[model samples]
Target: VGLTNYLYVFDTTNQSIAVGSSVTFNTNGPITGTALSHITGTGNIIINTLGTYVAEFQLQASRENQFSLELNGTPIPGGRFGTGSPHSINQGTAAFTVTVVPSTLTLINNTSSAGTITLSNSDGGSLTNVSASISIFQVG
Candidate 1:
């Protein structure tokens, strides 16, 4: 037997996350490794093995919203941030490099209305390709 490592990069580009709702990244694009084969559109990242992992997401929104990063549906202390309309596109970013032991990780939208974000593969353009993104790395 041997150790297996995983990396999952989900795209949230050009999508709007509605208020009072949640988003569980989609696995329907490039760069999505086998690490996310177990994901069923549930915003939660399911962890089956024990290890220290890091989860991160970045997005641009129309309005500043308070997003909650949680593990297994429980809020992670000091994991909330306020991101305004950076560059007039309302860009917001959040990164979490936590030590988790076989659990689920997800994001919650706490804004009053829909805040749209995007994920792209461009360096620079009329629309910055730095809005919607979800990335995971095992750092144990």
Candidate 2:
């Protein structure tokens, strides 16, 4: 939607996909802040400036899913669950932690301005649908 393109994500779930760089994930939960979860895949960013490369592990949010996003042991604001006591998320309840690890890039195609992102977790859970986010800006 502008003159510049700002995008980042995990290229694959194989944990070995070489996307010209390295892929790493962080947290979006309310517990462990924002910690790096997966560091297997290659996350690459088109750099042309003297800025920083921020990795952003995405947290899946849906009508049934409610949670926060974390990165490096810190919760991400404005990306948390809304108010309500649902089956998966309860408002005001902070359990935000980047729980998805060994995550794979399910989808990462962008253009025009807005973009779509998708990720998969290898963590053994009761369900395959969980919250996660890319640890953008900082893989350090």
Candidate 3:
């Protein structure tokens, strides 16, 4: 009935996301509560409880890219974020609330162009430690 179910996942290695591909999280972070789970290297958050949730994600990428949150294979409205330019270290976060059935949530590189987006772990020869992360909390 409160903020009791949540999951956090992240990836430290660089991931080359091809056009029309999803970002994979290879590491699982601290998780509290139940009904939310993830498989390492799958990048899909399995939601077992049917309710409203607040989902958030942060990604550090190289070059211009667009990313969106997909619930059960469909992109959620207003759940997209992006960056500009190819020569800058772009990092951003997006958060949205959704009422979902027991389904899977994914972060997708929905950029509509023929290019690869490097989800980076380093900037200018310096390692930043973590590349990308996502957190989901059941709110209602």
**Residues 66-118, model 2: lDDT tens digits:** 33333332334443443232222222222222234422222122111112222
Estimate every model's Cα lDDT from 0 to 1: 0.53, 0.30, 0.77
TM-score of each predicted structure versus truth = 0.61, 0.24, 0.84
* Candidate 2 stretches greater than 4 Å from native: 1-7, 11-38, 41-63, 82-140
Clashing pairs in 3: none
What alpha-carbon RMSD in Å does predicted model 3 have with respect to the real structure?
2.5
Best by TM-score: 3
Ranking by lDDT: 3, 1, 2
TM-score: the better of candidates 2 and 3: 3
Better of 2 and 3 by lDDT: 3
lDDT of 1 by residue, 56-81 (tens): 66645555555766766666665555
Residue 102 CA displacement from its true place in model 1, Å: 4.7
